[PDB]
Design a protein around this nucleic acid. Structure first.
Ligand SMILES: [Mg+2]
Ligand SMILES: [Mg+2]
Ligand SMILES: [Mg+2]
Ligand SMILES: [Mg+2]
Ligand SMILES: [Mg+2]
Ligand SMILES: [Mg+2]
Ligand SMILES: [Mg+2]
Ligand SMILES: [Mg+2]
Ligand SMILES: [Mg+2]
Ligand SMILES: [Mg+2]
Ligand SMILES: [Mg+2]
Ligand SMILES: [Mg+2]
Ligand SMILES: [Mg+2]
Ligand SMILES: [Mg+2]
Ligand SMILES: [Mg+2]
Ligand SMILES: [Mg+2]
Ligand SMILES: [Mg+2]
Ligand SMILES: [Mg+2]
Ligand SMILES: [Mg+2]
Ligand SMILES: [Mg+2]
Ligand SMILES: [Mg+2]
Ligand SMILES: [Mg+2]
Ligand SMILES: [Mg+2]
Ligand SMILES: [Mg+2]
Ligand SMILES: [Mg+2]
Ligand SMILES: [Mg+2]
Ligand SMILES: [Mg+2]
Ligand SMILES: [Mg+2]
Ligand SMILES: [Mg+2]
Ligand SMILES: [Mg+2]
Ligand SMILES: [Mg+2]
Ligand SMILES: [Mg+2]
Ligand SMILES: [Mg+2]
Ligand SMILES: [Mg+2]
Ligand SMILES: [Mg+2]
Ligand SMILES: [Mg+2]
Ligand SMILES: [Mg+2]
Ligand SMILES: [Mg+2]
Ligand SMILES: [Mg+2]
Ligand SMILES: [Mg+2]
Ligand SMILES: [Mg+2]
Ligand SMILES: [Mg+2]
Ligand SMILES: [Mg+2]
Ligand SMILES: [Mg+2]
Ligand SMILES: [Mg+2]
Ligand SMILES: [Mg+2]
Ligand SMILES: [Mg+2]
Ligand SMILES: [Mg+2]
Ligand SMILES: [Zn+2]
Lengths: 97, 135, 53
RNA sequence: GGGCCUGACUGCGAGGCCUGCAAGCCGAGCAGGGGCGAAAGCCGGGCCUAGUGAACCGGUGGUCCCGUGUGGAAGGGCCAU
RNA sequence: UGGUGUUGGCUCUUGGUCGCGCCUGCGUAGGAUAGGUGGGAGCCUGUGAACCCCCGCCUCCGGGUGGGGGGGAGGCGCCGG
RNA sequence: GGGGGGAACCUGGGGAACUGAAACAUCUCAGUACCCAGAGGAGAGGAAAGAGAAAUCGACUCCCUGAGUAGCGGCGAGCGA
């Protein structure tokens, strides 16, 4: 799981904080932290294949921005895309952002 | 399920909530018989039926009264309700919406119990359908 | 104290405040403790009753 | 042993004992409201010396002191446990 | 390993609960299959009675209820054991 | 147009341990050392969806002060606007 091609979401570094005890709101003495360590939080990357100008274009995008792709496809209706290789097609789509 | 019971079935929208100054104009066309008819007002409560303090004990009536200042009784059941007389079939309008207006606010004057004391208050005649209204 | 010799408060029966803390044996004294005592709020002696601590 | 009773008080406390600290101990007397006694008086638990646990965190009952622009509320302070 | 995203179509059996209707409620005196309280001397019929034909049924085996085909003037309660 | 280099300085991405807590795990050391990417003679930041109580101020940076204050904190060691 890497980076979103639409939103640019990357993995972030987050802490897993291990806690113990009863919150003071629940009448307890309070929370004691029994461990902090680093983990990562990855974007919900998924594969999105779309047909644009006869070519099969696929995006690695976070699920959050899945529609943003289809939006991009609609925006590609007025583009001289015919003849192009999949790679440069995607570039044109991406450039519409 | 009589000839007059379903001839009031298109004098009633049982899927419509009314006000008090509009449910006395629609209980005279629902009360038409060969003798006089007690147009009965009923209501669902909101207390515990096995708690001995949450009972409804008392009397009213006024401004006007019965019909035959006519202190009408009203008491609850062993599953929570009321069932009380009267304001019979004319007994003029806007003096029937005025005798139906100082009784709904009587029983609400005998409340710390649990659950809203204002549920379902249906006004039906001796031989008619039931109007939902607003207590 | 012990399980059978408990701790308790005496609540002023008039203003319902707790002014005294003491102990009793609940096998010996199953009934609620009842004693007259000076309530600093009421500024007079008042029957005080055992309430749980 | 028996009557009445709740001082197994509330607000203070001169003065000391002990003592590195922190504690621990004894305490007359003044006021409040009481108990017993005709009264002098005595009564701030128990013949005495063991029967115990500093702070920190937090619970419950008061108080109504603070309340993050203002009124509240959350939260906390104080008294008690 | 549960929930959720990626993750959609159809079908069947389903369920929570919200409302509504039609119904189900038989310890014992008893007309006799009495849910809780209540209003109420009239109600139900040319919106077709009383007995029949197929009964959706339930039923403590006596009974409770509904539709239409036969079907043309009673039934059901007051009273009061 | 890019590529690579530059003592130290700078921003961004990542990011320790000894140590201190006279043991240790939350805390500390410290977002330090270090790795990486980028920038330039500087870099960052920068024209209020701001402060925060002044019915007030008016981009940002930098120094003095506010201040070891407010607070944070196994309310410990310490950290600290
Ligand atoms: Mg975690
Ligand atoms: Mg903590
Ligand atoms: Mg996909
Ligand atoms: Mg979404
Ligand atoms: Mg005490
Ligand atoms: Mg004792
Ligand atoms: Mg006081
Ligand atoms: Mg003796
Ligand atoms: Mg004695
Ligand atoms: Mg004695
Ligand atoms: Mg006396
Ligand atoms: Mg006292
Ligand atoms: Mg001294
Ligand atoms: Mg000393
Ligand atoms: Mg001691
Ligand atoms: Mg005195
Ligand atoms: Mg005296
Ligand atoms: Mg005397
Ligand atoms: Mg005296
Ligand atoms: Mg004294
Ligand atoms: Mg001691
Ligand atoms: Mg500590
Ligand atoms: Mg505390
Ligand atoms: Mg205040
Ligand atoms: Mg004070
Ligand atoms: Mg405020
Ligand atoms: Mg105030
Ligand atoms: Mg505020
Ligand atoms: Mg206000
Ligand atoms: Mg408080
Ligand atoms: Mg408070
Ligand atoms: Mg999982
Ligand atoms: Mg799923
Ligand atoms: Mg260069
Ligand atoms: Mg960095
Ligand atoms: Mg860095
Ligand atoms: Mg590492
Ligand atoms: Mg360490
Ligand atoms: Mg150490
Ligand atoms: Mg050391
Ligand atoms: Mg060691
Ligand atoms: Mg740090
Ligand atoms: Mg370089
Ligand atoms: Mg360059
Ligand atoms: Mg900039
Ligand atoms: Mg601007
Ligand atoms: Mg300017
Ligand atoms: Mg720090
Ligand atoms: Zn008191």
């Amino acid at each position: 799981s890497k980076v979103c091609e639409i939103s640019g979401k990357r993995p972030i570094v987050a802490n897993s904080i291990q806690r113990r005890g009863k919150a003071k709101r629940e009448g307890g003495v309070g929370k004691k932290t029994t461990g902090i360590s680093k983990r990562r939080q990855y974007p919900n990357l998924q594969k999105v294949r779309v047909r644009v100008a006869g070519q099969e274009i696929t995006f690695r995008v976070a699920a959050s921005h899945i529609p943003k792709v289809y939006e991009l496809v609609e925006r590609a209706k007025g583009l001289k895309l015919e003849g192009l290789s999949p790679k440069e097609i995607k570039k044109e789509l991406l450039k519409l952002l | 399920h009589g000839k007059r019971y379903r001839a009031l079935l298109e004098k009633v929208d049982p899927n419509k909530v009314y006000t008090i100054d509009e449910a006395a104009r629609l209980v005279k066309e629902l009360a038409t018989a060969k003798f006089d008819e007690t147009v009965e007002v009923h209501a669902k409560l909101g207390i515990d039926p096995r708690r001995s303090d949450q009972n409804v004990r008392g009397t009213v009536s006024l401004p006007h009264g019965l019909g035959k200042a006519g202190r009408i009784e009203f008491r609850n059941d062993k599953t929570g309700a009321i069932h009380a007389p009267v304001g019979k079939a004319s007994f003029p309008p806007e003096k029937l919406a005025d005798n139906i207006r100082a009784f709904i606010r009587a029983l609400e004057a005998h409340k710390g119990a649990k659950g809203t004391f204002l549920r379902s208050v249906y006004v039906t005649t001796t031989m008619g359908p039931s109007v939902r209204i607003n207590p | 104290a012990s399980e059978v010799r408990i701790k308790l408060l005496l609540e002023c029966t008039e203003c319902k405040r707790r002014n005294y803390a003491t102990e009793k044996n609940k096998r010996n004294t199953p009934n609620k403790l009842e004693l007259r005592k000076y309530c600093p709020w009421c500024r007079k002696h008042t029957v005080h009753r055992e309430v749980k601590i």
